[PDB]
Amino acid sequence: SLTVGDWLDSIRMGRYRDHFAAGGYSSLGMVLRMNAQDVRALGITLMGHQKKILGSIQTMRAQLSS
Amino acid sequence: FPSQPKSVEDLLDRINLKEHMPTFLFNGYEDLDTFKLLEEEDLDELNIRDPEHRAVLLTAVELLQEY
């Protein structure tokens, strides 16, 4: 389900649900425009978690472009 | 697969780099689906500077892309 909270749980990053919600990312369409600065500004500090989230965003944008 | 690394700990044990296990597991690389994203610049940020360690880690990452 292309919910922000379902997307986060699908990559084991459900700990950041409240971070995304607080930052105003109420849709996945808003998440797909994010960059590394947007991810850090949610308060996400762990390097690998930043890398996993951005890599998922990069892949999801490629899978929706064409 | 039964024969495949089951965890980051298992993988580091197999490649003889358990000294880096707290470094990866305290910096967001606790799961193999994140470990497989590592690149050279990420090892710099993790202060993993030994060239032999670095080559061994990047070989193991390439093998997980197969996984």
From Swiss-Prot, chain A:
It is found in: Cell membrane; Cell projection; Early endosome membrane. Phosphorylated. Phosphorylation is stimulated upon binding of its ligands including EFNA2, EFNA3 and EFNA5. Ubiquitinated. Ubiquitination by CBL regulates the receptor stability and activity through proteasomal degradation. ANKS1A prevents ubiquitination and degradation. Specifically expressed in the central nervous system. It comes from the Eukaryota. Residues 2-63 form the SAM domain. Belongs to the protein kinase superfamily. Tyr protein kinase family. Ephrin receptor subfamily. Heterotetramer upon binding of the ligand. The heterotetramer is composed of an ephrin dimer and a receptor dimer. Oligomerization is probably required to induce biological responses. May also form heterodimers with other ephrin receptors. Interacts with FYN; possible downstream effector of EPHA8 in regulation of cell adhesion. Interacts with PIK3CG; regulates integrin-mediated cell adhesion to substrate. Interacts with TIAM1; regulates clathrin-mediated endocytosis of EPHA8. Interacts with ANKS1A and ANKS1B; EPHA8 kinase activity-independent but stimulated by EPHA8 ubiquitination. Receptor tyrosine kinase which binds promiscuously GPI-anchored ephrin-A family ligands residing on adjacent cells, leading to contact-dependent bidirectional signaling into neighboring cells. The signaling pathway downstream of the receptor is referred to as forward signaling while the signaling pathway downstream of the ephrin ligand is referred to as reverse signaling. The GPI-anchored ephrin-A EFNA2, EFNA3, and EFNA5 are able to activate EPHA8 through phosphorylation. With EFNA5 may regulate integrin-mediated cell adhesion and migration on fibronectin substrate but also neurite outgrowth. This is Ephrin type-A receptor 8.
UniProtKB/Swiss-Prot annotation, chain B:
Expressed in the microvascular endothelium of various organs, as well as in parenchymal cells. Expressed in the endothelium but not lymphoid cells of spleen and thymus. Residues 3-67 form the SAM domain. It is found in: Cytoplasm. It comes from the Eukaryota. Interacts with GNAS. Interacts with IQGAP1. Interacts with TRAF6 (via C-terminus); the interaction is LPS-dependent. Interacts with MAP3K7, CHUK and IKBKB. Is a positive regulator of NF-kappa-B signaling downstream of TLR4 activation. It acts as a scaffold molecule to assemble a molecular complex that includes TRAF6, MAP3K7, CHUK and IKBKB, thereby facilitating NF-kappa-B signaling activation. Regulates TRAF6 and MAP3K7 ubiquitination. Involved in the regulation of cell mobility. Regulates lipolysaccharide (LPS)-induced endothelial cell migration. Is involved in the regulation of skin pigmentation through the control of melanocyte migration in the epidermis. This is SAM and SH3 domain-containing protein 1.
